Structure formats: structure tokens, C-alpha cells
Symmetry: D4
Subunit: 89 residues, 8 copies
């Protein structure tokens, strides 16, 4: 249930960026999904937003979304991917 909710809370957040950048920044959804994924995960290998609105949202989106996104990657890591290898080794 914890991995379920972190997973849902993440998808929704990603869905929200995707709708946002693909409307406001004019990205195709796949590129907007990617800009959301690499921004929240802090990879950051894209150019920055071009509209001021996309800039203000990216700031709010990063503060709100990073903690949830990293929360999932953490619970994903230690509660789903690890045991698999760990019991197996």
C-alpha cells in the first residue's frame, strides 16, 4: 500500500507536469513527460522553460515534487528492487 500510494502520487505529479509543459511550453506530451521526469529527479539535461509562466511553475513544481519523487525512488529501491537481488544473493 505504501509503494502503491507513492507510485500513484508520482504518476499524478508527472501527469500534471506533462499536461502543463505540453500546453504552456508547447511540448509534445512525451517531451513534457521527460522534462517533468528529469527535472523532479534533478538530472536536468534539457534547456530551461521558455515562458515566464513555465519558469514560475517549474520552481513550485521542483519544491513540491522532488520530495515525493525521491520518496518513491527510495521505497522502490529498498522495498521492491533490493529484496529481489538480496534474497537471490
Amino acid at each position: 500500500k505504501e509503494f502503491q500510494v507513492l507510485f500513484v502520487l508520482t504518476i499524478l505529479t508527472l501527469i500534471s507536469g506533462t499536461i502543463f509543459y505540453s500546453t504552456v511550453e508547447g511540448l509534445r506530451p512525451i517531451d513534457a513527460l521527460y522534462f517533468s521526469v528529469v527535472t523532479l529527479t534533478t538530472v536536468g539535461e534539457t534547456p530551461p522553460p521558455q515562458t515566464d509562466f513555465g519558469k514560475i511553475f517549474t520552481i513550485l513544481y521542483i519544491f513540491i515534487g522532488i520530495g515525493l519523487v525521491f520518496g518513491f525512488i527510495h521505497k522502490l529501491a529498498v522495498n521492491v528492487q533490493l529484496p529481489s537481488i538480496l534474497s537471490n544473493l
Copy 2:
């Protein structure tokens, strides 16, 4: 009070970068606010500073500011956004 202070310490830090880059690098404040936000959060999807002074400051600003910035995102996450969803689920 802890979420208050981390929040203030953050705003001030952001305000300090914003004043800095919008003066020294010639950015408009909104872009300077963004360069500060994506640099401290380690997203990093902008070009680097262009002046040597902006470069020296970005190094000091990253060391000083990252720990405070990530401190807020953490307390924000676990003490304000989580309970909301957690009590609700």
C-alpha cells in the same frame, strides 16, 4: 516554527541569488530566481554563469545554499505534504 525558519532561510537565500544574477549576470529577476532555484536544487538545466564573478559566487552559493535548500524540501516533504496524504489514506 521549524518549517517557518527553513522557509525564511530559503526565501532569503533565493532573494540573495536573485539580486546577484540579475545585477552581475544581467538576468531579469524571474530568470535569476530560476537560476538560483535550479542550481541550489541541483536540477541545473540552464547554461553556466558568463562572468568570472558569477562563477565564483555560484561555487560558494552552491556549498552554503544546497544544505539549507534540501533541508526545507525535506521538512516540507515529511512534515507538511506527507501527513496531508497519510492521514487522508
Copy 3:
């Protein structure tokens, strides 16, 4: 054995990206190895993938791979590089 496995799990993951980007994105292996290394570590100082397939994979690769990659850097840090300096100081 823990530092061994985290090390192997990492190499394999890196090997998987390297095969991927050097085939799908057309990178030479050394550049594909680098795109995998700087993406999983969240440095992110390259352009983004150019194919949609490379984009979808980079999203999955980041979620799966970041937790393992940061796990290794952590165990590397505290169990191999630290003691060396710490016993020595």
C-alpha cells in the same frame, strides 16, 4: 560481498545503458557510457535523448538505476574510501 554486488549491479546497469544509447541514439560507446553515468548520478550535463524511444528508456532507466547507483556511491564512500582516510587520520 555487499560492495562487490553493488559494484556488479552498477556495472551491468551501465553496460545496459551503454548498449542502449550506442545503438538507439547512435552514440559511440564511450559517450553512451558517459550519458548513462551522468544521468543516473543526476549530473546531467549533456543534451537530452533525441529519439522518443531513448526518451522513454531514460525515464525508466533513471527510476530503476538511480537508487542502485546512489547505493553504490554511498557504500563506496562509507565502507571503502572513508576508513582509508579515517584510520589514517
Copy 4:
């Protein structure tokens, strides 16, 4: 002594990148210092290395250096910058 050593271990590491990129990549030291600082801290707002040698080193440098660099920012944060504000509030 702990904040001293983490501080020294960091400077040395930065000094090592700076010598490296300013020789191998042809950067002026100030830009090489910056590429080292934003790469180890995972900001990553520069282009990637241009030589294959600079690429291989950046991979090794990131694995070795990130754990030490983040160790300092952490001890800096919680043992030097925090108390200052915390005792004061």
C-alpha cells in the same frame, strides 16, 4: 577536526579536477574549478567534456568525489551553518 578534514579532502579533490580540466580540456582554471564544483555537486549546468580522456576521468571523478563532496556539504550544514541560526533562534 572532522569539518577540517572533510574541508581539506574536498579542496584537494577540487584542485585535482581543476588541474585536470584546465590541462586536458583546455579550460582556464576558474572554469575548470567550476566544472569540477558543478559536476561533483550534481548541478551539471555546463556542456560535457570534449575529449574522451576528460570523459573517462569525469566518470571516475564523479563516483570517487560525489560522496566526499556531499559529506562536506552535510557536515558543513548540520555542524557549522545550522547551530549558528539554531542557537540564534
Copy 5:
């Protein structure tokens, strides 16, 4: 954060109040001694004799499992969120 120290505090008092009612009725302790038996049992000090009735024995087992984690939770929150900061302010030069 304080609401947290408040509830842990209340949850503790209640638990202690429960033991006190229990041992002072079932074991025949005076409340002050029953309060003490609850406090030194949950905190794991344990410098009293054990319960004498089988009912007091069964309850002490359940009481220890349920109560130890709450009790030690309060001592910890007490420690870091009320005594520490106070120590910190008390050590400031003025």
C-alpha cells in the same frame, strides 16, 4: 512537533493511569506503588518484585509489549524536542 509531544505525553499518562488502576485493583497495590510498578516496568528498570496473581502476570506481558514502544517514544521526543533545545538555550552566553 509539539502536538506530537502533547499526544505522546497524553498517550503515556493514559497508559500509566491504566496500569495504576490495574495493579492497585488486581494486585492490591496502593495507587502510588502501582504507578511506580507501571513506570519502572514500561521503562525496563524493573526494581520491584514480579506480579503475584496470574492475571497480573498475563497483563504485565501484554502491557510491556504495547506500552514499552510508546513509553520509549515519549522519552525520545521529550529528549530531543523539549530537554535538548532547553539545554541549547541554557548554554547561550548573555
Copy 6:
């Protein structure tokens, strides 16, 4: 997560069952008292006399080292994964 609380729970019962069989046979305790001696020894309360036989003494040393970590593991998982959330839901206004 629950499977975790299940196993810690089982591992604990078994351990307690082992002590109970042990002290009630070797020390001559009635099972209820042997269950209690195991519970207050592993939880470190310790409000009983010590074992009387040398065999009960050797076993209590090994039993404490092996069992304390499991027992305290269950009290912790119990605490944060079963009592806490319940406390949290119980404090929701409806």
C-alpha cells in the same frame, strides 16, 4: 511490511515458547511464570530472581544475546507499523 510484522511476531512467539519450555522444565517453573521470566528477561525489565541451576544460567546468557535483538526488533516494528498508524487514524476528526 506486514509480512515483516508477521514474521517478527512469529519469530518472537517461538522464542518465548522456547524459553517457556526451557524454564518450566529445567528451572521447574509453571509455564505462566516461565513465559513471564522469558518476557521480562528479553525485554530487559528483569524483576524476577535469577535462574537457580547452572544450566538455566548458561541458557539465560545465550537466550539474552540471541533474543534481545529480535524482541526489540518486534517492539519497534509493532510501534511504528501497527500502533502509530492506528494512533494517527484514531486522532482523525469525523
Copy 7:
């Protein structure tokens, strides 16, 4: 870091000194026994009888809640910041 081990150390001594004064006056213990009762009560060992006066009982409850967290804080800082490094240096080949 050391200043931290210094203060935790002082805070502890003071606390112990307080109990010692207390039990040796109110309970009629000789100071050495009162020092011991404070040390084994705060550390949760608890291999003494309980207090005999109601005043000693009330104080032991408050003393345990206030003192356990500090005492266990010192044992922890002692452990990782003074005994460990020493263990580490002691295990270096020369």
C-alpha cells in the same frame, strides 16, 4: 563534537549528583549506595530494591523520565565519539 561529549558528561554527573544527594538524604542511603541507585535506575539495570518513602517514589518516577534520555544520550556519544575511534586507532598496525 567534543564540547558535545563535555556537556553530556557534565549534564550526566550533575544528574547523578542530584539523585545521590536525594536518596542519601530522603531514603537514608549512604552516598555510594545512592550514587549506585541513581546509576542503575537511569541506565535501567534496576538491581536494587525500590524506594521505601512515597517521596522517593514520586522523585524516582520524575527522575527516570527526565534522566533516562540524557543518560542514554551520553552512553551513545561516549560510544561513537570516544570509545569507537579509540578502538579504531587501537586496531591500527604499527
Copy 8:
């Protein structure tokens, strides 16, 4: 990691051996009882009487402060690095 469990293990045995020598000489305990007094005092169980000599009392105070942190360090490393993985492998279907 194992070297860590090895040393914690050795450090513990030595400490126990020290108490055992001590109480069996100074307190007049037989070694098996002195081993037990050391084990239940460091682990904070504490289901024995206290020391009878003032020297045994002073040593038990120092012994508790120095030893508790090491002893609890071993029980923890024992727990997560030797018993847990074993539990984990033991619960694998084959």
C-alpha cells in the same frame, strides 16, 4: 562488515571476561555467577542483587558506562548482520 562483527564479538567477550574475573574475586562469586552478573548488568536486565562491597559498587558504575555501549553495539550488529540475513535465507522457498 564481518571483521566488524568479529571485533565487536571479541571486545564483548573480553569485557565479560573482565567482569567475571572481577566479581568472582572481589565479590566472591563463582565464575558462572559472575559471568551472569556481568551479562545481565551490561544488557540492563538486572535480575540479581546489587554488589555487596563498595569496590564492587564503584566498578559496577564504571563497568556499566564503558560496557553498555559496546554490548548494545554487538547485539545490534549481531541482529542486523548475522541473525537477520539468516532469517531471510531461512524464509526462501526451495
